[PDB]
Design a protein around this nucleic acid. Structure first.
Lengths: 431, 95, 254
DNA sequence: TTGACTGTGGGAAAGA
DNA sequence: AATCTTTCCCACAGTC
């Protein structure tokens, strides 16, 4: 069996040059509707597993350069809930860059309040990739459709959170068409969907692309703006309105809870509401308003149901060749702090999913590291001589990258850059 | 040419008599504030050494006090880091 | 209500319906470098504090001040005359670190003993990630630095932005000297964080034999679910820590 | 065509 | 009470 291999200096230089980050991405909602008895109410927005990153293509080359078929070198995936061995459903990635798991269910036999999705991944040639977990999802029995309030609620929508919208045509399961943005065009694709920031805007604002944002939880009858997370193509101002029984209700000050059938209204646009005509989104009339001025009869294809969504991301790279040990513990670093100065210049790393088999790398320099806990690690900053040979002391600020390396050589990427602080005096703490 | 590399090599001897001699006759090259090998003038490395007579003679002969060395620090920073209290006196008095 | 996150417009068909203190490099001031370093450097810092010297000057990069530099480099003599010169001890840097946080992190014993004896010094200071100095002392397992804060009437039952307690970090790093002194001075034995986790859970996750033993000595409740209804025995068996499971199966039952 | 299922929404019923 | 969360219960509109 292949033993652990310490990451060398020139391999780190090669990583700094190429940067083939094999990033793994998971989009999934934060709320799951529970199923009772033997029912099977699926998650309306299917968990979407993306595989962004150029380095993935490199992984296609190296393995195929060692005698592997296109079927053997393709990573098969499994989706499941962790605490129960109720078999992991299969995900296939034949010629796609992503996939959605639309056949998942949660029975009432599991009395957990929260859970989290588990994704096993391995190549066809039995080479394991590992188990990646997504952010937590809350179980719900029925959406809080009553007149909730802000006092103790926390399942409503905050301005600036990733949300998603979908449709259901006459209680048909296959008729679900999700809101997506691609090619600078808003699609109603029944196969893809992105993360949508929703910003509460003041009643008096500007035309677009420049506005005064507003804080606070989002209620009905307000003015909101939807912005795709990746494309950035925004929509003009809209007004969310709760609907039921093909009738739109506008005079409502209730908060926007989860799994709500809302409607969007354009200012000074009569009754033209954003609806879907099969494959594309179009504005629809919805004329009748006879019972009350606050009751507009809106046709089908309009029960846009809203649901919040999070985003899990785990990026890494194999700097010392593929190893037998799975890369299922992916460390994340949320912030980096300082601990001393001079000869005892240490750094405190605050993150999540840390492993004791990890060592910090200040660019291309291996430093002494201590494992405090699974979310906190201390390290010793090396001398400036490792970067500038002739320099006895730090002369001018030097910006190096900070990364994490496992014993086997799996290099993990961070987004924080260390900066050597320049020192006026020469020799520090001479003794 | 050869007279320019004299101060950068004579200040590393901590000799006040030789400095006063080579500066009484003065010079024509007008080296004055001269950035040394580390980009530090004779003033800066004289503060590094920690002798008040050398820095005082330098300030006497037109050596500007409020100049930043090659790396960006003034004459006061090195005096504050070295701990020599007598240097900051004349660095503040000259303002 | 000041920021803005732009995008790009998009419409369906028909839009007409709309109708002498030298700045130097970075942020370092002569008094800052004096506090960072027969060298009468304490007397130099003293003479520097007088006259026209600005004490409250933050770094351009790190956001730290002169007192922060005196705390990091363990220059207690500088911090003495700084506090005597009516300096501030509750200044947050670019990372939220108060001078007490830098004194605890850098293991500045003298600066620590000087700051705890100061009146206006905050002990429940919250940084950007809300970590308190009483939590840092247990996170770094610095001997003696913990009990001096509790005797100075610090909040032992404190939480960060996440909601972790000092006992949580004491159980994570397995600092028995921290958890013991905390529980003796009225620490909550079964505090739940925002993720509904008990200190025993974090002790069983990272293999904290002695800290879990102490929590069992202080009668911690083994049966507390997390946000996924996982008991400490469950995470212990998942992480494959058999001796911790045996401690949860034998030591101090009922 | 008829027979046995099936995810989804909505209201009655049951606690709280 | 007037709200709310949690369990069943059952008829569309389609696929199997």
């Amino acid at each position: 069996r292949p033993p652990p291999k310490r990451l060398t200096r020139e391999a780190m230089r090669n990583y700094l040059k190429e940067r083939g980050d094999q990033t793994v991405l998971i989009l999934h909602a934060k709320v799951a509707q529970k199923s009772y008895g033997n029912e099977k109410r699926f998650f309306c927005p299917p968990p979407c597993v993306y595989l962004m990153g150029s380095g993935w293509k490199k992984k296609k080359e190296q393995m195929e350069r060692d005698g592997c078929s296109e079927q053997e070198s393709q990573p098969c995936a499994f989706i499941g809930i962790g605490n129960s061995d109720q078999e992991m459903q299969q995900l296939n990635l034949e010629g796609k860059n992503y996939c959605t798991a639309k056949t998942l269910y949660i029975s009432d036999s599991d009395k957990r309040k929260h859970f989290m999705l588990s994704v096993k991944m391995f190549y066809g040639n039995s080479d394991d990739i590992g188990v990646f977990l997504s952010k937590r999802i809350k179980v719900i029995s029925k959406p809080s459709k009553k007149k909730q309030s802000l006092k103790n609620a926390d399942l409503c929508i905050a301005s600036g959170t990733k949300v998603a919208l979908f449709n259901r045509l006459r209680s048909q399961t296959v008729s679900t068409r999700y809101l997506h943005v691609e090619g600078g065009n808003f699609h109603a694709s029944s196969q893809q969907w992105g993360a949508f920031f929703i910003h509460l805007l003041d009643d008096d604002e500007s035309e677009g692309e420049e506005f005064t944002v507003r804080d606070g939880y989002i209620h009905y009858g307000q003015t909101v703006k939807l912005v795709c997370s990746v494309t950035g193509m925004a929509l003009p101002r809209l007004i969310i309105r709760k609907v039921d029984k093909q009738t739109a209700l506008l005079d409502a000050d209730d908060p926007v809870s989860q799994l709500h059938k809302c409607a969007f209204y354009l200012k000074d646009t009569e009754r033209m509401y954003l609806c879907l005509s099969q494959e594309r989104i179009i504005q629809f009339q919805a004329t009748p308003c006879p019972k009350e001025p606050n009751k507009e009869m809106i046709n089908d294809g309009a029960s846009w149901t809203i649901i919040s969504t999070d985003k899990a991301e785990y990026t890494f790279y194999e700097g010392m060749g593929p190893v037998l040990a799975p890369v299922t513990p992916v460390p994340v670093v949320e912030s980096l702090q300082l601990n001393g100065g001079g000869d005892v210049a240490m750094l405190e790393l605050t993150g999540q999913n840390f492993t004791p088999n990890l060592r910090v790398w200040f660019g291309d320099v291996e430093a002494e590291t201590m494992y405090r806990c699974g979310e906190s690690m201390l390290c010793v900053v090396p001398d400036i001589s490792a970067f500038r040979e002739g320099w006895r002391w730090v002369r001018q600020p030097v910006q190096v990258p900070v990364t994490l390396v496992r014993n086997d050589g799996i290099i993990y990427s961070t987004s924080l850059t260390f900066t050597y602080t320049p020192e006026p005096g020469p020799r520090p703490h001479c003794s | 040419q050869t007279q320019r590399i004299f101060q950068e090599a004579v200040r590393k001897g901590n000799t006040q008599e030789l400095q006063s001699l080579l500066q009484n006759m003065t010079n024509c090259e007008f080296n004055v504030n001269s950035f040394g090998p580390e980009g530090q003038t004779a003033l800066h490395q004289s503060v590094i050494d920690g002798n008040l007579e050398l820095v005082k003679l330098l300030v006497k002969f037109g050596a500007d006090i409020r100049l930043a060395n090659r790396d960006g620090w003034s004459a006061l920073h090195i005096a504050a880091f070295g701990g020599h209290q007598d240097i900051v006196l004349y660095l503040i008095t000259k303002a | 209500k000041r920021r803005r996150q732009h995008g790009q417009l998009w419409f369906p068909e028909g839009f007409k319906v709309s109708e002498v203190n030298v700045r130097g490099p970075d942020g370092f001031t002569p008094l800052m470098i004096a506090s960072c370093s027969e060298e009468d450097a304490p007397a130099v810092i003293s003479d520097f504090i007088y006259q026209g010297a600005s004490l409250h000057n933050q770094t351009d990069r790190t956001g730290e001040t002169a007192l922060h530099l005196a705390a990091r480099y363990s220059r207690s003599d500088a911090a003495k005359r700084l506090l005597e010169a009516s300096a501030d001890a509750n200044i947050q840097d670019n990372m939220g670190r108060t001078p007490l946080h830098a004194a605890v992190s850098a293991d500045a014993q003298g600066v620590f003993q000087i700051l705890i004896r100061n009146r206006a010094t905050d002990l429940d200071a919250r940084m950007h990630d809300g970590t308190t100095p009483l939590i840092l002392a247990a996170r770094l397992a610095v001997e003696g630095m913990l009990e001096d804060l509790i005797n100075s009437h610090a909040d032992v039952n404190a939480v960060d932005d996440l909601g972790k307690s000092a006992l949580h970090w004491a159980a994570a790093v397995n600092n028995v000297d921290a958890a013991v002194v905390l529980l003796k001075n009225g620490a909550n034995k079964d505090m739940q964080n925002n993720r509904e986790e008990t200190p025993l859970f974090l002790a069983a996750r990272e293999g904290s034999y002695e800290t879990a033993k102490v929590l069992l000595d202080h009668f911690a409740n083994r049966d507390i679910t997390d946000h996924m209804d996982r008991l400490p025995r469950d995470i212990a068996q998942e992480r494959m820590h058999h001796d911790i499971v045996r401690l949860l199966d034998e030591y101090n039952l009922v």
